[PDB]
Design a binder for this molecule. Sequence first.
Ligand SMILES: Cc1cc2nc3c(=O)[nH]c(=O)nc-3n(C[C@H](O)[C@H](O)[C@H](O)COP(=O)(O)O)c2cc1C
Length: 138
Amino acid sequence: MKIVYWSGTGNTEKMAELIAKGIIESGKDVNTINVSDVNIDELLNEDILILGCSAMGPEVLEESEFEPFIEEISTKISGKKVALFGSYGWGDGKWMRDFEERMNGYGCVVVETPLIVQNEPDEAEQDCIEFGKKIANI
Ligand SMILES: Cc1cc2nc3c(=O)[nH]c(=O)nc-3n(C[C@H](O)[C@H](O)[C@H](O)COP(=O)(O)O)c2cc1C
């Protein structure tokens, strides 16, 4: 499987590692890829797209790298299963509510409730591992 993410300080990156750990513990292989190193064509062969990005301002996906990536794959992901996650700071998840609506609007099937964690996981580490386990059971 593959996990694609963008992280500015490392909070979403840590979540990605924990989600990967959950998938691996379930017995499956998985690679974590930063959005800047992703190959669109290879990513589209995946049964499930696991995408993460922290909340940028004002309550939007990161603009220079992550959003253009979403825009690029938007026309080629209809019918695909997707799992979404990300870290946020002072808001209450608006950027994620919008991200979920958007992916659904492109025809994707959001397989699980998006996982959002405030700042660094730390206290929520097991929740990240558990999210990976749920995805591995799909
Ligand atoms: C320029 C900027 C804008 C931000 N805008 C928001 C926002 O609108 N809502 C929010 O909850 N957090 C916002 N944050 C906080 C980040 O989402 C938060 O620090 C998160 O933990 C970053 O995770 P990362 O290291 O993966 O990027 C913003 C952070 C930055 C640097």
